[PDB]
């Protein structure tokens, strides 16, 4: 046992998509508020979400400073003022490395143009939370060659649906004259084992 | 929207789904392949969470699966860009920007102070030596 | 100091060497021209209270140069709560009989305000520890001042990352852990009383005093330092006090 009031936060989890990273935890405070601290293995601790009653804390602005670094956060529980229980109680979060763990966002097919017997499919680059002096960097700007986009396309008279892959944001596939095709794209970081693919983009078809 | 006569028109994804909202079967009849229909259904039937325009203070919402992402303007942060960075000037936040000592003043702006041997500069945050050998400085490096 | 580096001459200007009857006793930290902060346990066996000397501007124990200044220690103030033989409240405030002269080689480390130290300095990851102590656990002491960079840990972490030992001192609110648990670097016997100095926006402050440990640089263990922030008030009040006739003074704490 230790001090009177307050309980330590638990189940710290990282919610991250295209680098928009939010730390979430339990439980819903009762006569206690929280403050979050985050740091790289060798760097100083930076406080965020000061005395918040929320059970989440946006850490985006800190991690986009270097998405490849490995961050650790911890959540402190303070007794609501007077309840000074008769160092503060805290809990560490799992380590988190943005570049290797952030979820790849849902892509969007920007357009598709017919060119005789071939079809070009363009993926709109996805904006990420990483900034480059006034603008938001794209998934490709951040991952470069580590990022590829996959395309699923099918006819209607087809029986299986084919796939194509690209190192850019454009596909140039061979199609059958006449027939109308349907497409769906997916972001992928092949060098990943877990979370290596984004959710599929809305389906688009030539009508 | 299926109302006798419209149904005479040939199955069109665009007309039965993008303009009239389809159900799962109507869409599958059009796609024929179940995995194809799923693929289409995951997003179509997910919902536009950005509809509640959740990103505040000029933020930009981008849809995701059962969620969304908010892109905030420089002076804001938070899942919904609700946090005003300009309202966090408190001592527990990187020492309130003070070079040495920071004193919080609820109701008003925090102030910065300095250790004996130093004095506050016009900028209200920096400290400068008032003696030849202030504490905490290494002369041979300085 | 185990696994550190030689602190280049004049770069650890607040370091103090305490001697008794001419032999090296412990390290210390100059906080102004007449007061030196050290560790209380360094004085458990003193019999000749009048033979206490503080040397500033020292570097190479094997040779004297014109930068060293020696001063008689007129008073040794330790908290009454401190118990000889133990580790809690391991701090001593020393009054030099005459003030030292501030020079390029002799400068005080800033003693910080309590709030600033608890809310800001406590979160600066790395800090420097120095001394002429043992270069290895139970090894020989250093001739040239040694210094080491060590990361600070909150006690919960220190306790969770340390090998359990059936009988060992409690880590109290008056202490904090800093160092490495991989047996590679640490402060050691002979470094006691020396500073744990923290750099913050252009200025160095006193955050800790070399105090104790399970041996030195022992796998599964960290150095333990006196948490200076808990004594700021006690130190300032005492520095305003009028001298006693006797040297040792056990002052009430808080
Ligand atoms: C030189 C002055 C002399 C009269 N005083 C003492 O010997 C003395 C007086 C006291 N009240 C307490 C002590 C004392 C008791 N028990 C200790 N460790 C436990 C875990 C076994 C202990 O670390 N001390 C203090 C001490 O030796 N200080 C020197 C010191 C400072 C820093 C570190 C470190 N960061 N790793 C290690 C050591 C150290 O040498 N510790 C040890 C511990 C056990 N056996 C040999 C050496 C020692
Ligand atoms: Ca959605
Ligand atoms: Ca010398
Ligand atoms: Mg239309």
PDB file of C-alpha atoms in Angstrom, chain B residues 91 94-95 97-102 104 113 115 118 133-141, chain C residues 9-11 14 102-104 107-108 110-113 116 119-120 200-205:
ATOM      1  CA  UNK B  91       5.057  26.313 -15.503  1.00  0.00           C
ATOM      2  CA  UNK B  94       8.430  23.245 -20.513  1.00  0.00           C
ATOM      3  CA  UNK B  95       8.955  25.607 -17.568  1.00  0.00           C
ATOM      4  CA  UNK B  97       9.195  29.113 -21.497  1.00  0.00           C
ATOM      5  CA  UNK B  98      11.171  30.625 -18.604  1.00  0.00           C
ATOM      6  CA  UNK B  99      14.989  30.283 -18.806  1.00  0.00           C
ATOM      7  CA  UNK B 100      15.285  29.774 -15.057  1.00  0.00           C
ATOM      8  CA  UNK B 101      12.445  30.108 -12.535  1.00  0.00           C
ATOM      9  CA  UNK B 102       8.719  30.046 -13.445  1.00  0.00           C
ATOM     10  CA  UNK B 104       2.249  30.385 -12.169  1.00  0.00           C
ATOM     11  CA  UNK B 113      12.351  34.889 -12.428  1.00  0.00           C
ATOM     12  CA  UNK B 115      18.518  32.966  -9.449  1.00  0.00           C
ATOM     13  CA  UNK B 118      21.214  37.017 -12.539  1.00  0.00           C
ATOM     14  CA  UNK B 133      31.225  34.453 -11.969  1.00  0.00           C
ATOM     15  CA  UNK B 134      27.526  33.585 -11.866  1.00  0.00           C
ATOM     16  CA  UNK B 135      26.642  30.231 -10.344  1.00  0.00           C
ATOM     17  CA  UNK B 136      26.239  27.399 -12.807  1.00  0.00           C
ATOM     18  CA  UNK B 137      28.392  28.660 -15.690  1.00  0.00           C
ATOM     19  CA  UNK B 138      31.730  27.109 -16.710  1.00  0.00           C
ATOM     20  CA  UNK B 139      34.173  30.007 -17.405  1.00  0.00           C
ATOM     21  CA  UNK B 140      36.747  28.182 -19.529  1.00  0.00           C
ATOM     22  CA  UNK B 141      33.991  27.103 -21.942  1.00  0.00           C
TER      23      UNK B 141
ATOM     24  CA  UNK C   9      40.635  20.996 -15.834  1.00  0.00           C
ATOM     25  CA  UNK C  10      38.213  23.735 -14.853  1.00  0.00           C
ATOM     26  CA  UNK C  11      35.124  22.112 -16.348  1.00  0.00           C
ATOM     27  CA  UNK C  14      32.214  23.570  -8.256  1.00  0.00           C
ATOM     28  CA  UNK C 102      35.646  32.801  -7.489  1.00  0.00           C
ATOM     29  CA  UNK C 103      37.913  32.267 -10.529  1.00  0.00           C
ATOM     30  CA  UNK C 104      37.939  30.500 -13.892  1.00  0.00           C
ATOM     31  CA  UNK C 107      32.685  28.586  -9.395  1.00  0.00           C
ATOM     32  CA  UNK C 108      29.613  27.560  -7.400  1.00  0.00           C
ATOM     33  CA  UNK C 110      23.431  26.891  -8.521  1.00  0.00           C
ATOM     34  CA  UNK C 111      21.264  25.607  -5.708  1.00  0.00           C
ATOM     35  CA  UNK C 112      17.753  25.762  -7.285  1.00  0.00           C
ATOM     36  CA  UNK C 113      14.297  26.648  -5.954  1.00  0.00           C
ATOM     37  CA  UNK C 116      11.756  24.488 -10.398  1.00  0.00           C
ATOM     38  CA  UNK C 119       8.729  20.247 -11.881  1.00  0.00           C
ATOM     39  CA  UNK C 120      11.497  20.902 -14.341  1.00  0.00           C
ATOM     40  CA  UNK C 200      19.052  23.324 -18.098  1.00  0.00           C
ATOM     41  CA  UNK C 201      18.827  26.125 -20.647  1.00  0.00           C
ATOM     42  CA  UNK C 202      22.421  27.321 -20.272  1.00  0.00           C
ATOM     43  CA  UNK C 203      22.878  26.843 -16.535  1.00  0.00           C
ATOM     44  CA  UNK C 204      23.925  24.066 -14.165  1.00  0.00           C
ATOM     45  CA  UNK C 205      22.050  23.221 -10.937  1.00  0.00           C
TER      46      UNK C 205
END
